[PDB]
Design an enzyme around this catalytic site. Structure first.
Site, PDB file in Angstrom:
ATOM      1  CB  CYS A   1      -0.973   0.000   1.193  1.00 56.94           C
ATOM      2  SG  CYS A   1      -0.330   0.566   2.797  1.00 56.94           S
TER       3      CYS A   1
ATOM      4  CB  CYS B   1       2.384  -7.151   2.926  1.00 62.60           C
ATOM      5  SG  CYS B   1       0.931  -6.227   3.411  1.00 62.60           S
TER       6      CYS B   1
ATOM      7  CG  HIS C   1       0.920  -7.189  28.538  1.00 60.45           C
ATOM      8  ND1 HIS C   1      -0.216  -6.553  28.996  1.00 60.45           N
ATOM      9  CD2 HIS C   1       1.173  -8.186  29.416  1.00 60.45           C
ATOM     10  CE1 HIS C   1      -0.610  -7.123  30.118  1.00 60.45           C
ATOM     11  NE2 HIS C   1       0.218  -8.113  30.398  1.00 60.45           N
TER      12      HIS C   1
ATOM     13  CB  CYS D   1       2.179  -1.929  28.660  1.00 56.02           C
ATOM     14  SG  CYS D   1       0.864  -0.741  28.308  1.00 56.02           S
TER      15      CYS D   1
ATOM     16  CB  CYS E   1      -5.451  -2.121  31.377  1.00 50.94           C
ATOM     17  SG  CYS E   1      -5.082  -3.491  30.246  1.00 50.94           S
TER      18      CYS E   1
ATOM     19  CB  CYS F   1      -4.892  -3.746  24.249  1.00 53.53           C
ATOM     20  SG  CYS F   1      -3.147  -3.367  24.102  1.00 53.53           S
TER      21      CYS F   1
ATOM     22  CB  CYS G   1      -1.234  -2.815  20.631  1.00 52.33           C
ATOM     23  SG  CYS G   1      -0.049  -3.841  19.730  1.00 52.33           S
TER      24      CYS G   1
HETATM   25  S1  SF4 Z   1      -2.942  -1.519  27.596  1.00 52.13           S
HETATM   26 FE1  SF4 Z   1      -2.504  -3.395  26.306  1.00 52.13          FE
HETATM   27  S2  SF4 Z   1      -0.243  -3.724  26.457  1.00 52.13           S
HETATM   28 FE2  SF4 Z   1      -0.808  -2.241  28.126  1.00 52.13          FE
HETATM   29  S3  SF4 Z   1      -1.145  -3.472  30.029  1.00 52.13           S
HETATM   30 FE3  SF4 Z   1      -3.189  -3.300  29.011  1.00 52.13          FE
HETATM   31  S4  SF4 Z   1      -3.366  -5.094  27.563  1.00 52.13           S
HETATM   32 FE4  SF4 Z   1      -1.164  -4.884  28.205  1.00 52.13          FE
HETATM   33  S1  SF4 Z   2      -0.239  -1.878  16.470  1.00 53.16           S
HETATM   34 FE1  SF4 Z   2       1.886  -2.111  15.669  1.00 53.16          FE
HETATM   35  S2  SF4 Z   2       2.783  -0.003  15.815  1.00 53.16           S
HETATM   36 FE2  SF4 Z   2       0.941  -0.013  17.120  1.00 53.16          FE
HETATM   37  S3  SF4 Z   2       1.705  -0.491  19.252  1.00 53.16           S
HETATM   38 FE3  SF4 Z   2       1.074  -2.483  18.279  1.00 53.16          FE
HETATM   39  S4  SF4 Z   2       2.989  -3.262  17.330  1.00 53.16           S
HETATM   40 FE4  SF4 Z   2       3.371  -1.026  17.780  1.00 53.16          FE
END
Ligand code: SF4
Ligand code: SF4
Ligand code: FCO
Ligand SMILES: [Fe+2]
Ligand code: NI
Ligand SMILES: [S]
Ligand SMILES: [S]
Lengths: 482, 279
Positions: free
Chosen positions: B14, B117, B204, B207, B228, B234, B261
């Site tokens: 893309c 990709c 995580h 995080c 969270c 996530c 994420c």
């Molecule tokens: S926001 Fe996502 S990466 Fe961060 S503690 Fe919660 S589940 Fe884990």
């Molecule tokens: S989606 Fe991709 S760029 Fe965004 S926090 Fe998760 S791994 Fe990093």
């Protein structure tokens, strides 16, 4: 002189995979075919998924204009789900998407188009090139163009920082979902966005808009070619309130010298000359089907052929600026007079022939960038720090919705049908689809194919004006095919 | 020094990989192009076009056989005899992505598969697709092409992952030569072909909202930034990338702060990370 047939694959300094083939007779293009050569099939990949996934998946149609697909998708989902987007989320969405208009137009003029008129540094990827490239600028002005190309690399990056402030990252925002925007703007981040915006504004007003008119004044012949059908589409974009009726770009169709209303039921996609099953031809997007047929005799593109009540229309900045006819920028008014002897106040004062031209499409894109500055300025005064930007709607079992917007390159719609809480159909009708499509079932050419007719080729060994015309439309074949 | 020649071939991509690279802060993209690499073929940005652009790449490839770097963006579709991705035409013959990879792949010093990709198949290979979209390493291996492949995934990758991997490889080559240096690069790749400096740590476990996860405090709406994001979908628990401290676009945001994420650097993206908005 007689005929020479010229094939260009890849057309470069566009996005995606395009072949152009032109027939030149007696020094002019007399026929053309455009072929989009790469297919992925998002419309079938999407089937069976949680509908909310679409607003991420569809962005991967294109990494230059992902916010446009994000927007069309969340609007389609908003409609299908009955999500009532909070006012502050509407404004936040406009700030996310609007910043990418700035990014995309600057990228297009400097990093895709400018080498059509400017000789870059003597190293790859700026050389080798056609030995007779028709680069007319003085040494000083050429150097200024290169200096601006380099500065614009920083400016476009700053625009993506603006997108990411409320969008999460770019390419491929996380910040737009059904129901609004995922991050409430804070005062601190609005200052960060505004500080970047000031730098972009200064570049647009002081460098970009002036350079387009100045370069145009050395290529005045390029306003006299590329008219094509002189027919245009705008579906509306950037809601300015929650009424659904006031938008920064209002919808309309322009064809055969006449403005008319936009009725989306008149859109049909033809496939006689496209690599899709014959039985799928002539479908409105609400009944759209995507069945690839790469071995179909006579077809020459993975782009379907959209027609509006049988009309072949173009989309993009020229289309929007012509349909909406805003006042020209102060820069444009002054340089039109001083460099062209043209007295103009509003966009249509350029005249139909000069606006619908190779150089006119570059002018329209620069003017539109200036126009977008004022919209972003307004949204920065309208947004309320701290006010919630999202609702959390339940996924429906059965629903349909259509999202209409204007991507930087032109009109974009996404249609979604949900059944058993999953995507049953998803159909995309995108900007470069309108511009870069092949013939329809009656043999009528697509907009760029038609705009190539009459393009001068005085030197068949250096046929530079063919791709110059194509680039004026800012093609994105990833979007066109999906 | 003499900047290595690079060819950038786009398959079913893309252009998000190219755009993300344009967002590099330090070094800037101008510094990358004028001082780090010699980008000899790239359809989005190069001056020439058509068969002349293809022939230029072929002439450089001949001159620098075994010494150029091949960046592949997008997947390689093998169905319909390669016809779902035509990348050029020269001497009256179309050139599919399949053909191009078979032509240049064997003669590159290394292949950099940029983006999910190219690395793993990604969205074009996901359920509902029908083009035979294939990851670069699989395509090359299936065809007996032994050139080393470095995967730099993400949809898109962070620019620092692309530039940083190039710099790491060029550093290794400066100090050990081409074969020695590529050996050192391969040693720092994980089992999915990813450089451990960028992909060796879990989102995580690093995080900033992990305290809320452990306390069971979950946001019920995207705009609640205290909790969270797990219940909102996530995928940080299953994702190996350094976004938690690298952030995006000049440090202004990242996916978990802004929304969730989606696991975009992982070999099973997107299907193994979907639905995106439920746990
Ligand atoms: S926001 Fe996502 S990466 Fe961060 S503690 Fe919660 S589940 Fe884990
Ligand atoms: S989606 Fe991709 S760029 Fe965004 S926090 Fe998760 S791994 Fe990093
Ligand atoms: N801009 C943009 Fe992309 C295209 N063409 C879409 O829609
Ligand atoms: Fe479509
Ligand atoms: Ni696009
Ligand atoms: S695009
Ligand atoms: S966009």
């Amino acid at each position: 002189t007689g005929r020479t047939t010229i094939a260009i694959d890849p057309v470069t300094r566009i996005e995606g995979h395009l072949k152009a083939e032109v027939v030149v007779e007696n020094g002019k293009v007399v026929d053309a075919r455009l072929s989009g050569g790469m297919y992925r099939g998002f419309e079938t990949i999407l089937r069976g998924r949680d509908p909310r996934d679409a607003s991420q998946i569809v962005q991967r149609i294109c990494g230059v204009c992902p916010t446009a697909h994000s927007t069309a998708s969340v609007l389609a989902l908003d409609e299908a789900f009955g999500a009532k987007v909070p006012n502050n989320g509407r404004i936040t969405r406009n700030l996310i998407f609007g910043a990418n208009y700035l990014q995309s137009h600057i990228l297009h003029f400097y990093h895709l188009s400018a080498q059509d008129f400017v000789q870059g540094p003597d190293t790859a990827p700026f050389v080798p090139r056609f030995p007779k490239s028709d680069l007319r600028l003085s040494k000083e002005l050429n150097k200024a163009g290169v200096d601006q190309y380099i500065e614009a690399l920083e400016v476009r990056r700053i625009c993506h920082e603006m997108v990411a402030l409320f969008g999460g990252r770019m390419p491929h925002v996380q910040g737009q979902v059904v129901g609004g925007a995922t991050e409430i703007p804070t005062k601190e981040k609005l200052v960060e966005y505004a500080a970047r915006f000031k730098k972009v504004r200064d570049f647009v007003e002081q460098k970009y808009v002036p350079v387009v008119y100045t370069i145009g004044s050395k290529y005045k012949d390029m306003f006299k070619v590329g008219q094509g059908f002189k027919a245009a589409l705008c579906v509306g974009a950037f809601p300015l309130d929650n009424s659904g009726k006031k938008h920064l770009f209002m919808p309309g169709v322009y064809a055969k010298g006449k403005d008319m209303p936009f009725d989306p039921s008149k859109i049909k996609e033809y496939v006689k000359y496209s690599w899709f099953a014959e039985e799928t031809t002539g479908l409105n997007y609400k009944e759209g089907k995507t069945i690839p047929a790469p071995d179909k005799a006579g077809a020459y593109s993975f782009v379907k052929a959209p027609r509006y009540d049988g009309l072949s229309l173009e989309v993009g900045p020229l289309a929007r600026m012509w349909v909406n006819n805003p006042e020209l920028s102060p820069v444009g008014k002054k340089l039109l007079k001083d460099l062209f002897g043209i007295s103009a106040k509003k966009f249509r004062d350029l005249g139909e022939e000069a606006a619908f031209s190779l150089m006119g499409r570059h002018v329209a894109r620069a003017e539109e960038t200036y126009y977008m500055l004022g919209a972003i300025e307004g949204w920065l005064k309208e947004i309320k720090a701290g006010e919630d930007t999202v609702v959390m709607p339940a996924v429906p079992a059965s629903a349909e919705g259509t999202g209409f917007t204007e991507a930087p390159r032109g009109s974009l719609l996404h249609y979604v049908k949900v059944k058993d809480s999953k995507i049953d159909n998803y159909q995309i009708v995108s900007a470069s689809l309108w511009n870069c499509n092949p013939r329809d079932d009656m043999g009528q050419r697509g907009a760029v194919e038609e705009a190539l007719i009459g393009i001068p080729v005085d030197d068949i060994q250096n046929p530079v004006n063919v791709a110059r015309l194509i680039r004026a439309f800012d093609p994105x074949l990833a979007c066109a095919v999906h | 020094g003499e900047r290595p020649p690079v060819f950038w071939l786009q398959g079913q991509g893309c252009t998000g990989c190219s755009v993300t690279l344009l967002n590099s802060v330090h070094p800037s993209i101008a510094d990358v192009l004028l001082k780090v690499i010699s980008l000899e073929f790239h359809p989005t940005v190069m001056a020439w076009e058509g068969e002349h652009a293809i022939e230029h790449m072929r002439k450089v490839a001949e001159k620098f056989k075994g010494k150029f770097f091949l960046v592949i963006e997008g997947s390689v579709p093998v169905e319909a005899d390669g016809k779902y991705c035509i990348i050029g035409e020269a001497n009256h013959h179309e050139i599919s992505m399949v053909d191009a990879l078979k032509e240049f792949g064997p003669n590159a010093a290394a292949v950099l598969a940029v983006g999910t990709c190219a690395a793993y198949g990604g969205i074009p290979a996901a359920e509902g697709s029908e083009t035979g979209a294939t990851a670069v390493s699989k395509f090359l291996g299936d065809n007996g092409i032994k050139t080393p492949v470095v995967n730099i995934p993400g949809c898109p990758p962070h620019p620092d992952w692309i530039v940083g991997t190039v710099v790491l490889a060029l550093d290794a080559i400066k100090k050990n030569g081409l074969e020695g240096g590529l050996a050192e690069v391969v040693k720092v790749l994980d089992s999915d072909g990813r450089p451990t400096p960028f992909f060796g740590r879990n989102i995580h476990e690093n995080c900033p909202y992990l305290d809320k996860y452990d306390e069971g405090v979950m946001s019920a709406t995207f705009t609640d930034k205290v909790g969270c994001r797990y219940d909102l979908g996530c995928k940080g628990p299953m994702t190996m990338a350094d976004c938690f401290e690298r952030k995006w676009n000049g440090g202004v945001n990242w996916c978990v702060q802004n929304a969730v994420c989606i696991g975009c650097v992982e070999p099973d993206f997107p299907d193994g990370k979907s639905p995106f908005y439920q746990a």
